[PDB]
C-alpha cells in the first residue's frame, strides 16, 4: 500500500503510534518518517492525508532546539517557515519536540508531544 510520488514511495499508516515507534516502524520497512522538501511534496502529503493528522519526520536536534529531519535531510529554516500552521511551532507545555501534518493547507505543520500517538507517514526512495 505504498503510494508513489516523484521518485519516492510513501506509506500512510492505518495504526497510530508515538513518533519514535512510528520511526522504528518505518526503519523496519527500510524507510524513515517523511521529510518535506518542496511545496509540491507538502501538497501531495496534505492532500493524501485527507484532513487527518500524521506524524512526519520533524523532530528537535542540538542544544538550541532546532528542527531537523530524521532522514537527515538538512532542515531549511527559511524555505520551511511557510509550512507551519500560523502560530506553530509553539512548544505548547514546553513538551512538543516532534512535528506532524495537521491542517490540509500548505501551512500544515504543528509541533506536538512526541509521546502522543497518531497515524504516520513513511518515505522510501525508489532505487532502480
Ligand atoms: C497534544 C496536542 O496535540 N496539542 C496541540 C493542541 O491539540 C489539542 C488537542 O490535543 C485537544 O484534545 O483538543 C484541543 C482543541 O479542542 C487541541 O486541538 O492544539 C494546539 C493548538 O492547535 C497545538 O499547538 C498543540 O500542540
Ligand atoms: Ca503546537
Numbering used by the authors: 198 to 325
Give the original sentences from the paper that presented this experimental model.
A version of the truncated, trimeric langerin mimicking the naturally occurring minor allele with Asn-288 mutated to aspartate and Lys-313 changed to isoleucine (langerin-D288/I313) was created and compared with the form with only the K313I change (langerin-I313) and wild type langerin. To determine the molecular basis for the enhanced binding of GlcNAc-terminated glycans caused by the K313I change, crystal structures of the carbohydrate recognition domains of langerin-I313, langerin-D288/I313, and wild type langerin in complex with GlcNAc, α-Me-GlcNAc, and two GlcNAc-terminated trisaccharides (GlcNAcβ1-3Galβ1-4Glcβ-CH2CH2N3 (TR54) and GlcNAcβ1-3Galβ1-4GlcNAcβ-CH2CH2N3 (TR55)), representing the terminal portions of poly N-acetyllactosamine chains that are ligands for langerin detected on the glycan array, were solved. Because several of the structures show the same interactions, to simplify presentation of the results, only the data sets that gave the highest resolution structures are shown: wild type langerin CRD bound to α-Me-GlcNAc and trisaccharide TR54, langerin-I313 CRD bound to α-Me-GlcNAc and trisaccharide TR54, and langerin-D288/I313 CRD bound to α-Me-GlcNAc, α-Me-Man and trisaccharide TR55. Structures of the double mutant, with Asp-288 as well as Ile-313, with α-Me-GlcNAc, and with the extended GlcNAc-containing oligosaccharides, showed exactly the same pattern of interactions of the N-acetyl group as were observed for the Ile-313 mutation alone. Thus, the differences in the interactions of Lys-313 and Ile-313 described for the single site mutant can account for the enhanced binding of GlcNAc to the naturally occurring Asp-288/Ile-313 variant as compared with the wild type CRD. The K313I polymorphism is tightly linked to another SNP that results in the change N288D, which reduces affinity for glycan ligands by destabilizing the Ca2+-binding site.
Langerin, a C-type lectin on Langerhans cells, mediates carbohydrate-dependent uptake of pathogens in the first step of antigen presentation to the adaptive immune system. The extracellular portion of langerin contains a C-type carbohydrate recognition domain (CRD)2 that binds sugars and a neck region that mediates formation of trimers stabilized by a coiled-coil of α-helices. As in other C-type lectins, the CRD of langerin contains a primary Ca2+-dependent sugar-binding site where Ca2+ forms direct coordination bonds with two vicinal hydroxyl groups of a monosaccharide.
